[PDB]
Amino acid sequence: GIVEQCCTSICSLYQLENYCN
Amino acid sequence: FVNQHLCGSHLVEALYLVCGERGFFNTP
C-alpha cells in the first residue's frame, strides 16, 4: 500500500494522487 | 545523498498538498 510504495520505495505523483478520495 | 522517500509526517504533508479539496482517509 501507500507506506510500502511511497516510504519504502519511491512513488510518483500519480501513484500518490490515486490514494486521495 | 538526498532521498526521495515520503515517510511519516512528510507523507501526511504530501497527501494534504496533492489531494487538496478531494481529501484522503475519508468515506462518502
Author numbering:
A (entry chain A): 1 to 21
B (entry chain B): 1 to 28
The authors write:
It exerts its functions through binding as a monomer to the tyrosine kinase-type IR, which is an (αβ)2 heterotetramer in which each individual αβ extracellular chain comprises L1, CR, L2, FnIII-1, FnIII-2 and FnIII-3 domains. Therefore, we undertook further mutagenesis-driven studies of insulin, focusing on the TyrB26 site that we assumed might be the critical structural pivot of insulin conformational activation on its receptor.
This makes AsnB26 a unique single-mutation full-length analogue that is ∼1.7 times more IR-B selective with an overall wild-type-like IR affinity. The most important feature of these analogues is the occurrence of the B25–B30 bend that detaches this part of the B-chain from the insulin core. It seems that the B24–B25 peptide bond in [AsnB26]- and [GlyB26]-insulins serves as a ‘rotation axis’ for the B25–B30 chain, sweeping it almost 180° away from its wild-type direction. The side chain of AsnB26 is also near enough (∼3.5 Å) to the CO group of ThrB27 to make another hydrogen bond that would stabilize this region even further. Therefore, the introduction of the Asn residue in the B26 site enhances the stability of the newly formed, bent insulin conformer. Therefore, the structure of [AsnB26]-insulin with the characteristic B26 bend is likely not to be accidental but represents a favourable and stable conformation of this analogue.
